[PDB]
Write a protein that binds this DNA or RNA. Structure first.
Ligand SMILES: Nc1ncnc2c1ncn2[C@H]1C[C@H](O)[C@@H](COP(=O)(O)NP(=O)(O)OP(=O)(O)O)O1
Ligand SMILES: [Mg+2]
Ligand SMILES: [Mg+2]
Length: 424
DNA sequence: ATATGACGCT
DNA sequence: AGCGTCAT
């Protein structure tokens, strides 16, 4: 079995937060520009970067002041600030706009604020028998790249040349040629992407392949404003120089042990190993997953979920701003709870459901662990004061100070999350 | 002094 | 459950 039964696509917005600000502020269009959070510490932290500005080496996580050094024409748009914290509402709403449109073509799984996976298998079947064996016209694929093509014996001319070899080798006879199915999926994604641009003004990229992992890999091969098809046949060469860390779920500790333990560098080298070999190295689940994946085979299904299982608000208090007093802790819990009550009310009305669990998370000054304590209490009413007061209770026994007016050690992070939803 | 949401392990 | 891992 070759892991070619499904057509899966990943759609990801190009420099999402920038496009949202550029739609709103025409003066930012087609300029080096970036979106910044806060302002006081070193101009604010950069969180999204137009492609014009990336050409100067401006990146996410860079301070705005350091970014202006790399690029002094850089324009900045500031994230909105409510009750003393970053407020991402504009971008969540833009995301819903984009998800609604995508939903009209197939069932989607929201994977982040700006991307969704799409299972196109069923829509591919439909469009196939409508064609009645009609060949696929390169007219229908004006922004599609075929990975690994052209091959054998100017940016856009190279694209068409690869696209011509793909079609000129296609087998439109067999209505289950996996390569034909990917080509038809790619035709739908062009329609989906034109509709998103038409109805929002947002441009996006997309990957089309047989599973989530290849779709996501393909999406980033030709950003921005292009889509890439990765066929099962292109996987051996693609993977032969693909660093292991580029693959989703291997960008961290597991991927680094794969490199260290096996002494390899690229995804294609995993094929030498037996599945049993890989299970003893990395456990039974990772070994099986890896054995299949280095052959381009992956089974994670596209889950029909476009809303979330959790709604959270958090704020970091780094350095001098760490929370030292009880009354400081209570004020910020109030602020978090107020924004949280706002989003929960919106979610109970628009999507018809109610949370039953409140999770409270904190980080103390000196703990490397991104969260230090994580406790849960009942959630019965969408009332900020009640939520904020209950969060304090759950954490108040963690102020290790005999002075009760004081909070020690200082808190570096407050996090309030609502979960365990039920239909309402 | 790089705000969020999913899922795995035990 | 609470923690860890990984993602954008
Ligand atoms: N580590 C992070 N932390 C917080 N917000 C982030 C983030 N990474 C991204 N965002 C925010 C800002 C981002 O705009 C948005 C989508 O994340 P991406 O798709 O990873 N990056 P973009 O869409 O900007 O560029 P392109 O896709 O063309 O590479 O979510
Ligand atoms: Mg994006
Ligand atoms: Mg993204």
């Amino acid at each position: 079995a070759t892991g070619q039964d499904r057509v899966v696509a990943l759609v990801d917005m190009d420099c999402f937060f920038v496009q949202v600000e550029q739609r709103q502020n025409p003066h930012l269009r087609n300029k080096p520009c970036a979106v910044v959070q806060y302002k006081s510490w070193k101009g604010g932290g950069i969180i999204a970067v137009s492609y014009e500005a990336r050409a100067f080496g401006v990146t996410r996580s860079m301070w705005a002041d350091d970014a202006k050094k790399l690029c002094p024409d850089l324009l900045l748009a500031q994230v909105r600030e409510s009750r003393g914290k970053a407020n991402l509402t504009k971008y969540r709403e833009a995301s819903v706009e984009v998800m609604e449109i995508m939903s009209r073509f197939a069932v989607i799984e929201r994977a982040s604020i700006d991307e969704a996976y799409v299972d196109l298998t069923s829509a591919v079947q439909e469009r196939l028998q409508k064609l009645q064996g009609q060949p696929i016209s390169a007219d229908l694929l004006p922004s599609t790249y075929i990975e690994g093509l052209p091959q054998g014996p100017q940016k856009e001319g190279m694209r068409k040349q690869g696209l011509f070899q793909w079609l000129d080798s296609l087998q439109i006879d067999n209505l289950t040629s996996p390569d034909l199915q990917l080509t038809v999926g790619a035709v739908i994604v062009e329609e989906m992407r034109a509709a998103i641009e038409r109805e929002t003004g947002f441009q996006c990229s997309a990957g089309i392949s047989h599973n989530k992992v290849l779709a996501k890999l393909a999406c980033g091969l030709n950003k921005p404003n292009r889509q890439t098809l990765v066929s099962h046949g292109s996987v051996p060469q693609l993977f032969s120089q693909m660093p292991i860390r580029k693959i989703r779920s291997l960008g961290g500790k597991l991927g680094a042990s794969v490199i260290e333990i096996l002494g390899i560098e690229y995804m294609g080298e995993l094929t030498q190993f037996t599945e049993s070999q890989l299970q003893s190295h990395f456990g039974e689940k990772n070994g099986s997953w890896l054995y299949a994946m280095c052959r381009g085979i992956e089974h994670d299904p596209v889950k029909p979920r476009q809303l979330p299982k959790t709604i959270g608000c958090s704020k970091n208090f780094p350095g001098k701003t760490a929370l030292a007093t009880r009354e400081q802790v209570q004020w910020w819990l109030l602020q978090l709870a107020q924004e949280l009550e706002e989003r929960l009310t919106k979610d109970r009305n628009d999507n018809d459901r109610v949370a039953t669990q409140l999770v409270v998370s904190i980080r103390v000054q000196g703990d490397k662990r991104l969260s230090s304590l994580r406790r849960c209490c009942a959630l019965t009413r969408y009332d900020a004061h009640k939520m904020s007061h209950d969060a304090f209770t759950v954490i108040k026994n963690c102020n290790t100070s005999g002075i009760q007016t004081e909070w020690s050690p200082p808190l570096t992070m407050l996090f309030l999350c609502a979960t365990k939803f039920s239909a309402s």
